[PDB]
Scaffold this active site. Structure first.
Site, PDB file in Angstrom:
ATOM      1  NE  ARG A 148      39.944  47.003  47.143  1.00 22.46           N
ATOM      2  CZ  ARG A 148      39.101  46.807  48.379  1.00 22.46           C
ATOM      3  NH1 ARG A 148      39.301  45.804  49.157  1.00 22.46           N
ATOM      4  NH2 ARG A 148      39.150  48.366  48.616  1.00 22.46           N
TER       5      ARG A 148
ATOM      6  CB  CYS B  38      35.880  43.775  50.201  1.00 24.05           C
ATOM      7  SG  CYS B  38      36.376  45.109  48.749  1.00 24.05           S
TER       8      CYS B  38
ATOM      9  CE  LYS C 217      33.870  47.586  40.683  1.00 25.95           C
ATOM     10  NZ  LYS C 217      33.421  48.641  41.676  1.00 25.95           N
TER      11      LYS C 217
ATOM     12  CB  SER D 262      36.499  54.288  38.620  1.00 27.23           C
ATOM     13  OG  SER D 262      35.816  52.747  39.507  1.00 27.23           O
TER      14      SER D 262
ATOM     15  CB  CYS E 123      35.980  48.416  50.046  1.00 31.43           C
ATOM     16  SG  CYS E 123      34.977  48.631  48.719  1.00 31.43           S
TER      17      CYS E 123
ATOM     18  CD  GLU F 223      32.764  33.174  42.983  1.00 34.64           C
ATOM     19  OE1 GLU F 223      31.870  33.818  43.237  1.00 34.64           O
ATOM     20  OE2 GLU F 223      33.671  32.250  43.935  1.00 34.64           O
TER      21      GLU F 223
ATOM     22  CE  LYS G 193      34.995  44.770  43.022  1.00 34.71           C
ATOM     23  NZ  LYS G 193      34.391  45.807  43.987  1.00 34.71           N
TER      24      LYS G 193
ATOM     25  CB  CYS H 275      31.490  46.754  49.890  1.00 30.60           C
ATOM     26  SG  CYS H 275      33.341  45.192  50.357  1.00 30.60           S
TER      27      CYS H 275
END
Ligand code: ZN
Ligand code: ZN
Ligand code: ZN
Ligand code: ZN
Ligand code: ZN
Ligand code: ZN
Ligand code: ZN
Ligand code: ZN
Ligand code: ZN
Ligand code: ZN
Ligand code: ZN
Ligand code: ZN
Lengths: 336, 336, 336, 336, 336, 336
Positions: free
Chosen positions: D226, D135, D257, D284, D127, D242, D204, D125
């Site tokens: 985003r 991104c 994600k 995270s 980002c 997807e 994601k 990516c």
């Protein structure tokens, strides 16, 4: 369900509005609706005979009244329809592709002064713009007449690109011409409009429920037969073939016109394509049927319309195309 | 459907009438209908406004006037709703369970005289026979009211066994009280009526489409709503629970009411109990809605009732109850 | 999928705030929330430190005040939790079925004053009402302690039947004790309360996410382990049996505690039992995680509270219990 | 089912840690894990107390520090992220496709010092490497601003082919740009890296949980939002379409994600694609959330981290990307 | 089927021709028949030995003096099999592509006089047209006798083009040569007949029920069998593939042949392709079987032929190819 | 099914007899056949004209030599049918349950001079032994004649106990009275035949295929339809209710009679009850049809009657009752 009476009483879950509402399966709200706007090429604004309270707006401050009001009720997505005088209608419907048009001025306008606070859907068909009033180019080939497919589709291809340039978020072919979504996508994408989306009238059925929209858009044949493009309303499973092709060809949303007489078809489309978003048109005469019967005395107009939209959603429609939207959206406290 | 344009063009199958008829998923005829008869002691014929042309026949020569007319068209199945003066309604509903009351008199009349030439379904309820307009015994627990269940179920049993004793071929509980199928099927089995069937109004909804009925039946609820036993139009999957239990109880046939705005639910039931016959009730309202639009300009009465009744078949119904029945039957030339 | 790039561009539907809302699969409101009230015998509204915001309301004006608050935000669904001091706690459970103890009074007050504008769920356990804090009667059989089922079952039947009298719309058993639902349903049915509904905590798991509940209600196991009775969190399908048995037993609504960490179970139950109203408990701790991390720097409060509630809906639940209830219901400003 | 209390008692299989461990549906281990390594060019071991626990490794001598430890516990998979200062980021993001950049040097090293003893994934990516923080490549299509889909893919190609060369076994796009898998493939194939495989972050979601990994890589966004690439978290069924595209387009492993909040999606994706492998990045925030509740006492960090990791496994996930990995690995006594 | 005796008595729906017909799962009318006409170059009507009651008509004035009688009863769809004097018969089969043949005459004739009031399918094969009587063109490799798939397929193309040129509504490839549909579909499209459609003998079994037709058409094999092309009877599931491939190829209608003896396949295909209209062939000596046994004494000609036609419907078939249809259709009161 | 021609050429698998045989989904041996024996009281081998080939063997050398010959061809299991004249018939049907009857002697004999070497199903039905030819007991209650279900069904349990005592391994009820398998397995179980099994004619259709047997046995009903007890051939799904009830009631083997014209019902039944072993009756008419078509050489009697039998396998049937059993068991070498 090997649940059993009287250990299990289904009626426990209907003892009170506060509970039926908790465990209810479906819900409506104003965001689920798309309002259709009829657009005529300047002039006065005209009442519409079959369709009480619905109007044909000329492209001006008639916005102020309507698109802004509808926004101030929650309705924020619109579908636009050309309605012409016969004096500019030709057997290959030039109307549709005329940047100085009717609708592309409407698009330009609304999108200028409203911008991204709105989403504009744009009908792609020739039947509002043709001499004869079928949804395509005709061919008096030396046997009998028929709306010819492969040339009529390229007309839809041009139709789109005009509105795409004029700035419409979506384009939405109602022709029931085969390959329509294909030859649009490939137009658009060639003219650098990958950004533009396509909402296909995929399972559009040859219905008597259109009576009012024929009057309210000019579209209405002079050799009176839809039946060799619009789906035979005896066929539900046919609809899957039509949704599947309109998806490989690359439509983004798919729909079923009309809805109320086709709820059985909505649920059969929705449950083979859960991943697709699914629209459905609470059509022209599903409106005026309610209205006829509401004033001529028979049915509580408020309830019976929300009952009829809750139905369309319950079947599995994510988006509903009602002429009601506005007078349904202040309906904020329902009986069900 | 790993299928493309232009190798398969869906419109080949639309292009003749001979072919669309050749390939049509659905079809319909007058075997499928169940015509309802409104019936009263009165002695004088009495027209229902919000119909119309459907009358409240007295028990006399609606025989070799009207049932004999219906029959001549291919319509040999009838459901009876008895109607009556406030004078002779009390809170526990007696006029229903009353050998001498209306419905029984009619059942005996129609049987003795056609006999096995027709079927006689008998609605079983107390809405037409009570004081409060409601479908059961009413009570108070504290803050609020309710239609007590298991006390009314017993009354449905009596009615069921009264109409059986009179001649009834099927008994058909319209109450949406829980357990009723089983309290009927048992009380019947007890009086020696193994041979009498039960058509359960299994998934009947809290509909606004009934307006015309309650006037036709002098049955409007004099206070409050029925949203406390009739199902929540919000709910489809709830009707798989309601149909399953009615089957376990002994229901021979299971139905969806109303029909038009619940086609999704017809198909959902049907795709789940393929082995049960499934009835559907084209109601009080979806006749009155139609005759309204018809009278006041908007629609073709003929082509839109045959779109509507065909829709009911296509979704799954094996039988249709409808007040069109007779008129739909001479529509014996299929405009589609 | 017969669906390929570039012809299909999945980002088209992510293009605007307006279309993303259009085609979104899931949604939320206060209609979907069951706010817990932590209720206490007398004194002050004590703050509850591991769960900032939610105090322990003393049954009386200051509570019934705070419930109008909830009601003005759309929230109208409460599950009642009794907390009381060491001095009234004992081995075989008393407080729980003391007819004018903590929660009976609370039920009554809230019903008498609001009544049929507000639904009251009443929790049925012995954790908040015992000496040890274990959710059942503890016995000894020559090995070690064990929580006795069929004698604790019985005690719930007593607890439920008491709350039934007090006015509770629903009872909801959190003990994970086997056949609990049927004992409660048979008791209730026997003492007159067929009107009263059960919501089983059918699939409650042995989670770490309950810690701050055992600070709010002093439910801490004084020794040992819920694991003897609460479901092993390695087990998804085990919960299909737990739902199925509770449903045969006579449940009406079914739930899954905790919710966030068991979203995949929620889908699994919901796709096997589409016809059952599902609920789910955004617990004691999942709030206490969003709080501690937000309060101390790490993530945005209103987006992560919302994103988490949007999950439970999406996963399958028609109803969510949350101690975020109100603040999320003033989040009418849908940030996605 | 046909399974009933008391004849079947579920709790027989809950009554010891020796059968709960026997009948358990799920397992976990170091083998299942994939440990992220934040890597940066020159400096000290810069701590990420915005989490905390984890550090930012200076490419070189503190692999011993980490990788060689992790490996001593059986963690033998690693995905690499890159951190740069603002002085070294530009609107086309060249940090990525720079063989003496950060992330390509870290690959050379660990692949050189370990070999096939440790598998190495590489994040694809922009980002981390753009000055906007997005991104993709930003544009301004005559009107508003956006992230050009087709152009930003072709950078992901260069990144992947750079990291293939530099030594990665696997590559992993997370821009959610339509076609990312297809182009990264043809690039890799036609530089003779048909060996090297693609772990598509194919589902994601646009999450509040990333807050931390923003303050871990400096990838937060300037004209920030985003939602036009990263998914609408209302949507589960979207994720089939997807994923199913990234499979046609040649992906090898598929992932979701975040994880914790989208377990319901995982079960859905895995039950529709049983044959493909499936990872899920435990975010995270999902890591950080736990830690900051551990700080202030609300849960046992050890229980709730094994309970969370055992839930992603439970849902369907074959691999798990986790910052816990190394804690989770030395929990060799399954506490459930 | 959680239904139990005596509370459910399955016989209640068998007690009355009314109610037995009410709940009847299946129905029949002439609109389902396709009648086959055997056309010869001239002379008179040859009666056919094995098929007592069908004639070989001369392409003369018993067009109408059968085809007009067919129309009256309600049978408007015909399929045209040629019958040649075997002078005009060679190893390449040249009645097939001869514009002044029989089949092209009778198409040109029937449509001249009946127009689109009648639908006309032509059979497309070379067993009526080769001296050896195989459906394709023979060859010998290092093998021996073998029908060449890819050469013979091109003649069906040449054959079809002619029959559309002559004016057939539809065309129907009975040779069971592989890939035969898009080879016929690409001729037709490439010579402008986008409008003509294809009924594909997809699952055509290698059967002994053809004994009679072989005699009526002169289409008997002089050597070998049809087993190296026509389907092996042991296989039901092979017919899904064979259908599924013919529908990718551009087919419209899809039949199973023969019928009565392969009804399990008719249900197997219809249940895998519910959207596709499925025909079926009550074949040559499924009729001669009946006709023999009716003379013989043993079985009742009327009810047995309707039971057999009802069967092919009850299975799936939307259309029946039958040599009964005329006498079938004047049965206007139901056996069953 | 993304095979494409010409990559995939179905005809490879029809190439040679060996490869066809290699992949064939279905097989036959004589193991699958159940041969019926019409057994009469008074000694005289009486031929049957509407068969032919079959006889009314009297109980002795002649008969026991027939079965001796059967077994040698592998036909090792039989169903016994009692024929007898108009003296030994009577309203209640006594004939059937007399233990010195034909059928109980015929059993005991075969059982003497064969024992465990052979299996004996006994047909249980009063249509062979009544005045009137109906399968149960007629009651002329009111002014409608009807076969009485609960009174005939006890007399089935008698007939059943009687053949069980003669030594019948299985007992098989063919009257389609409801609750029959229940009545029969309560009686067998009571008189201590817990090892004697029931093969129900579960889904037995009211066919016109039965006329030869009516001649063989004299079951020809003197007045009326069998329509009120036999299944309406219009209905396939009605069969599953019929089988599932027979299974719950105690059946062991389940059958569908007739077979040929109900192959579709066989597949439908066998796919829902795959764990039940399924028989199917190749009937009287499916034999005598063939025989007459053969006798006036329309079709090849060796290939048709293996084509017919191979179909009843392909459909699902694990056992076939045929009169071709032997002449078809010798035909070792396959069609096909
Ligand atoms: Zn149009
Ligand atoms: Zn289309
Ligand atoms: Zn009623
Ligand atoms: Zn009910
Ligand atoms: Zn507890
Ligand atoms: Zn439980
Ligand atoms: Zn990124
Ligand atoms: Zn993607
Ligand atoms: Zn041929
Ligand atoms: Zn083929
Ligand atoms: Zn019999
Ligand atoms: Zn039976």
């Amino acid at each position: 369900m090997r649940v059993q009476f009287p250990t299990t009483r289904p009626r426990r879950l209907r003892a009170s509005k506060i509970i039926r509402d908790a465990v209810a399966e479906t819900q409506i709200d104003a965001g689920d609706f798309i309002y259709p706007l009829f657009v005529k090429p300047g002039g006065e604004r005209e009442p519409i005979g079959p369709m009480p309270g619905i109007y044909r707006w000329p492209v001006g401050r008639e916005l102020i009244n309507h698109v802004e009001e509808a926004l101030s009720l929650g309705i924020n997505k619109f579908i636009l329809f050309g309605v012409l005088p016969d004096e500019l209608k030709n057997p290959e419907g030039t109307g549709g592709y005329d940047p100085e048009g009717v609708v592309p001025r409407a698009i330009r306008l609304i999108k200028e002064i409203f911008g991204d606070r709105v989403l504009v859907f744009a009908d792609v068909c020739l039947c509002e713009y043709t001499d004869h009033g079928h949804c395509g180019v005709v061919k008096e080939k030396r046997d009998r007449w028929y709306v010819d497919n492969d040339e009529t589709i390229k007309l839809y291809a041009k139709e789109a690109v005009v509105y795409a340039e004029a700035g419409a978020d979506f384009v939405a072919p109602s022709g029931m011409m085969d390959g329509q979504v294909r030859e649009i996508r490939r137009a658009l994408d060639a003219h650098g409009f990958e950004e533009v989306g396509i909402m296909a009238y995929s399972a559009k059925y040859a219905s008597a429920f259109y009576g009012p929209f024929r009057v309210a858009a000019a579209s209405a044949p002079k050799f009176g037969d839809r039946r060799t493009y619009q789906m035979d309303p005896r066929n539900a499973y046919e609809a899957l073939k039509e949704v599947a092709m309109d998806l490989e060809e690359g439509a983004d949303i798919v729909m079923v016109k009309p809805a109320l007489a086709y709820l059985d078809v909505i649920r059969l489309v929705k449950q083979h394509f859960p991943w697709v978003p699914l629209a459905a048109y609470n059509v022209s005469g599903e409106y005026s049927l309610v209205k006829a019967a509401a004033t001529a005395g028979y049915v509580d107009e408020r309830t019976i319309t929300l009952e009829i939209l809750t139905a369309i959603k319950r079947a599995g429609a994510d988006l509903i195309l009602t002429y009601h939207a506005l007078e349904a959206a202040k309906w904020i406290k329902e009986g069900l």
